[PDB]
């Protein structure tokens, strides 16, 4: 930073972290296979947080993809196969709608209506298995008001979204009004 070398003055457009609202509609599909059922939602976040260990996908939607992964993990309802002993427990979750995310990550490049699938095995120790994803994050120029993005998680789960939302690499904060603004991802990531 400026304490180290010479001449890294910030730009006049956004000072350091000029807050901005990015309205965007989205779609999501999820499929989590595991050897044993997830006892707690924390284990679910641990198993899904490494969905981008080798990342090929979008950069302008990478924070958006992380938040969509978080919302999918929040609503990861079980399946009849998850019962006592039928097969490996297979989870599923899908969400669609529109939302706006307050964030301090700078101006985002214009997003397009393109879908990208994601596949990656996870190893959180006790639990084995893989994942599945299908995001459809894109801009929404319509004036139509959209629900707040962090509202899409039910209060039933995520007793502390400050860390449950941080398990995926996000850094959260509070806007002193009850709305969570996304500070940035994991540092250098």
């Amino acid at each position: 930073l400026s304490n180290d070398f010479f001449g890294m003055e910030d730009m006049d457009l956004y000072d350091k972290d000029s807050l901005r609202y990015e309205k965007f509609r989205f779609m999501l599909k999820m499929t989590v296979r595991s050897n044993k059922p997830f006892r707690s939602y924390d284990d679910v976040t641990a198993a899904v947080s490494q969905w981008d260990n080798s990342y090929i996908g979008m950069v302008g939607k990478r924070p958006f993809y992380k938040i969509i992964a978080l919302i999918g993990s929040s609503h990861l309802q079980a399946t009849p196969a998850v019962l006592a002993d039928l097969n490996q427990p297979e989870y599923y979750a899908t969400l669609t709608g529109r939302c706006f995310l307050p964030h301090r990550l700078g101006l985002i490049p214009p997003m397009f209506n393109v879908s990208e699938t994601f596949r990656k095995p996870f190893n959180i120790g006790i639990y084995k298995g893989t994942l599945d994803f299908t995001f459809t994050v894109s801009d929404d120029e319509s004036n139509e008001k959209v629900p707040h993005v962090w509202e899409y998680m039910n209060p039933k789960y995520q007793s502390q979204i400050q860390k449950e939302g941080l398990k995926f690499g996000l850094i959260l904060s509070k806007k002193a009004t009850g709305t969570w603004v996304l500070d940035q991802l994991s540092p250098f990531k």
């Binding site: 296979r33 039928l86 097969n87």
Partner: protein, 422 residues
């Protein structure tokens, strides 16, 4: 329209247009532009064991429901195993990417069926030895229920029984001797989607440990694509390059048939594509490559291949309500061109030794076969023969159609023996 049409009593236009007696062709590209996924509606609100008992007891009692068998086939074929080595993009759909394991249903979108689930004949004495042989039998009935004649259906059933016995080794037959119910399964859309997805998945992974399931679903490959299959067979039997063959087609309906047959954006040359399943996946309600929609080329190509002594082109059904004179003449001309005048030209050379002696009395104008394969030169010879085929062509056809014992009714062989064997 092509150009304007004038009836000269008042200089007025008529602009004729064909009636919609038969539905127009539909291409897979149009469907994949409309939707970016292939929905599959199934009822998953049941356990795997309960569905297995349902389908087992229904097959044994001959009253199994289509919803139950579809749900059980989904439940027993969730084998994510099978590692892709290359990308499997098809029609702008990213199935996988060079290393990620995919399942059977990873290539078709999955939804929830909106309807009521039948009660069932649930059994609990059947263990979890179902994935080895039961999906095989259930998919085999799909292919079996298309012969519509016992002397072939019996052979197909025996083959399916042997296929399943090689895995299970007990396999008491489930469906009774009579009382068929698998004939209706073709009508259902979800069953066709599942069977075609299974066929394509096991076609991509030939060396899979469950590749035996290709039996009973191989009929889905290139289903209702008889025109494309006979075009390939013709290109392979004539030995001529596949692009020079299309220059030879005549009669003015084969050309337009070909144009609708190979619209560029259809991806008919890629094996691991969605095109061969354009009708089972629901990509097209009326396949443009079918024989009912493409009668003239199918007839002409089958006749030509028969005149070239091909064992395949002796059982294809002769299409109705088409010309049987112009197409037959064109096919006979093609057959006499390829089967008599062998090309037999120098192909590889070491620096030199390339050409042919053109100064050693290379006369051309004669009442002899052109001794070549160019379409224009044989056409010039034929029109010098005033479009009346020579008796030598009749002799060639007689030699190529005679000794064909055991012909099949309504097929190309019977017509050739009745026509070119006067």
């Amino acid at each position: 329209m092509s150009v304007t049409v004038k009836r000269i009593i008042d200089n007025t236009v008529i602009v004729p247009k064909l009636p919609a007696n038969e539905d127009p062709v539909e291409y897979p590209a149009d469907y994949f532009r409309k939707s970016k996924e292939i929905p599959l509606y199934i009822n998953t609100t049941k356990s795997l064991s309960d569905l297995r008992g349902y389908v087992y007891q229904g097959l044994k009692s001959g009253n199994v429901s289509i919803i139950h068998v579809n749900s059980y086939l989904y439940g027993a074929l969730k084998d994510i195993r099978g590692k892709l080595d290359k990308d499997w993009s098809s029609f702008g759909i990213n199935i996988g990417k060079a290393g990620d394991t995919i399942g059977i249903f990873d290539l078709v979108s999955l939804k929830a069926l909106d309807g009521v689930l039948p009660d069932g004949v649930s059994d609990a004495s059947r263990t979890s030895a179902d994935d080895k042989w039961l999906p095989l039998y259930l998919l085999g009935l799909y292919r079996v229920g298309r012969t519509q004649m016992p002397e072939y259906r019996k052979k197909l059933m025996d083959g399916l029984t042997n296929q399943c016995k090689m895995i299970n080794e007990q396999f008491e037959p489930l469906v009774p001797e009579g009382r068929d119910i698998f004939d209706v399964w073709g009508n259902d859309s979800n069953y066709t989607k599942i069977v075609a997805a299974v066929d394509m998945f096991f076609h991509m992974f030939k060396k899979h440990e469950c590749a035996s399931f290709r039996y009973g679903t191989i009929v889905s490959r290139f289903k209702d694509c008889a025109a494309l299959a006979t075009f390939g067979h013709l290109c392979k039997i004539t030995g001529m390059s596949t692009e020079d063959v299309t220059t030879w087609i005549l009669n003015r309906e084969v050309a337009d048939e070909m144009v609708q047959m190979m619209l560029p954006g259809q991806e008919i040359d890629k094996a691991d594509s969605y095109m061969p399943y354009l009708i089972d996946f629901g990509l097209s309600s009326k396949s443009p490559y079918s024989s009912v929609k493409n009668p003239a080329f199918h007839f002409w190509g089958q006749l030509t291949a028969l005149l070239l002594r091909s064992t395949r082109a002796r059982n294809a059904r002769q299409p109705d309500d088409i010309e049987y004179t112009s197409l037959t003449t064109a096919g006979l001309l093609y057959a006499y061109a390829v089967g008599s005048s062998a090309d037999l030209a120098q192909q590889f050379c070491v620096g030199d030794n390339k050409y042919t002696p053109d100064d050693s009395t290379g006369g051309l104008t004669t009442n002899a076969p052109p001794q070549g394969r160019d379409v224009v030169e044989w056409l010039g010879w034929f029109e010098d023969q005033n479009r009346k085929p020579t008796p030598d062509m009749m002799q060639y056809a007689k030699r190529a159609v005679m000794s064909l014992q055991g012909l099949r009714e309504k097929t190309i062989g019977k017509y050739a023996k009745s026509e070119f064997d006067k």
